[PDB]
Amino acid sequence: FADVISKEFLHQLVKYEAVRHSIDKNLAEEFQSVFARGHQGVRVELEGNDEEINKYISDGANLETFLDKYEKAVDVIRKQVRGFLNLVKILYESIR
Amino acid sequence: MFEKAVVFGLYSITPVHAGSGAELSVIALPIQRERHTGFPVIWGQSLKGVLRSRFRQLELDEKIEVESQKWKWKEKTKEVLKEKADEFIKKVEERKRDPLLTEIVFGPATDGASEHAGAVSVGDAKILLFPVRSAKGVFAFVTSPIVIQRLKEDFELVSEIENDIELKQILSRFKVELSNNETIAGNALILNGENKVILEDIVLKVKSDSNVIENLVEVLKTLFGDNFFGKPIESIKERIAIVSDDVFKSFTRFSTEIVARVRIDAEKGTVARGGLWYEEFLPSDTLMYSLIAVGSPKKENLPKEVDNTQKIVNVLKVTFNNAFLQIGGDETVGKGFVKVRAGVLT
């Protein structure tokens, strides 16, 4: 779904997947919270020479509001979620 | 690298659910299908997994007859391995390794993966005859020129493997074309005084040609004999319908069984919250054929009764002809049983 996902239904889709694949409701809610918080900070490599977006991500700021002002936020959020799942896959393989 | 090929007819006696977990769909649990055509299919990895499991059980229980003689894997292990044979059988007794004939035919266990490979290459089970309900008669066995062309192309594989000539001559006269509003069906389905047959919810004008069904019928006799999985083949020739490729595709997509399973809360006595899921099943009396290609046994130090592929072939034919397997998993609810009838071509 990372290819075809947008910021509006990000939370709803993640919540559905969590409640579907978790054990109880509290674990699903915790997974939703940690995914929502963590996936904000992920660097992206757009086609254009864009470093301002990475600069906004590097601190934690109005970038979320700036993303709304940004003209290609859908690609940014898609790359963010895909990278977060890739890194969590790396971590899962490392522990397992 | 492959010398002999043996076909594997499959006739479902219970609904078959080959699970396909690589599907991004939550409506139901679908059966795996050929993505580029939609036809139902059973992957060789699934088919080989139930063949190897059944074959290993028979060898462990000492039920396989080799060259019309009983097979003792324990005694044969000493003849084959001599030294360290007692160590090897401990792994099998610990369920870490498989018996000798199982490892020779299908391959060694996961631990001994790099030791060698198997002797057989279990093909993919593809559709040959689909059961759809009909207005006249209980139901009909349906196929299409695309399936027939696939079957004829499969005999070319066997003919080239064995360097045979008559194998490709079996269906060389098969040139059947069908318009979307035409069909070729037996006399047990044709509506009286109309030359029409109603499969599912489609009215199809009956074409006037009897050679196509006749030559098709005897082809199954070549691979399966006269005994059509427990019934005379002439008794079912009257209920075989040939439909166009598109019409057959609609039957494969939508006429498969869909069952709404559920779980109930014991205390409340009603359906538990969120406990409702639906599955899709292949209909019973569905005829599918595989194609097992077997080469020389890679592993050396082997008994004379399993010397060549021809020796290996007779082991598979004897132990699998007219045998019931459980392909796919819904065993606890009695789903997946299928009659198996092997047999080499002419």
């Binding site: 779904f1 290819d3 239904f9 | 409506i27 997509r253 639906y278």
Partner: protein, 153 residues
């Protein structure tokens, strides 16, 4: 005109309709639960019986005479019971997706080209009905996912 853009349109449309239903009928959870169950049940009805059969079945739960088959003229707020409201909303969403997609501006503008899907089933060939069946199943899958995500019962 690839697969992923179609999936994007499906997700956006399903989220839009489910959010509209959640916001408009937030107070009454009965209609929300009925809509969720009806959505999760709908695609299987389509598979077992057909798109036309389930479309007619939806149209028969309106408790009010209909002048002519048309999804635009529907108004689910008129009906009183939660069952009829849920059936009307589900039928409206299905028909509007099959007739307009996510609007003319979006990449996917539907299949029936503005006609009522019931009429399309009525006078079109079997191949077109099958294609509309697959589209309805996909959009209903997305609607079920979003309804399970948001709607509460």
């Amino acid at each position: 005109m690839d697969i992923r853009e179609i999936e994007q349109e499906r997700a956006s449309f399903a989220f839009k309709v489910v959010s509209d239903i959640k916001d408009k009928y937030s107070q009454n959870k009965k209609v929300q639960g009925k809509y969720s169950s009806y959505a999760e049940k709908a695609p299987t009805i389509i598979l077992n019986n057909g798109l036309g059969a389930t479309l007619a079945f939806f149209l028969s739960k309106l408790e009010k005479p209909i002048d002519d088959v048309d999804y635009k003229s529907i108004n689910p707020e008129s009906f009183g019971n939660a069952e009829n409201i849920a059936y009307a909303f589900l039928y409206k969403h299905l028909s509007t997706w099959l007739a307009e997609g996510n609007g003319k501006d979006s990449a996917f503008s539907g299949l029936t080209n503005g006609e009522d899907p019931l009429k399309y089933i009525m006078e079109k060939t079997a191949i077109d009905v099958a294609i509309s069946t697959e589209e309805a199943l996909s959009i209903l899958n997305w609607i079920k996912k979003f309804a399970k995500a948001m709607l509460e019962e």
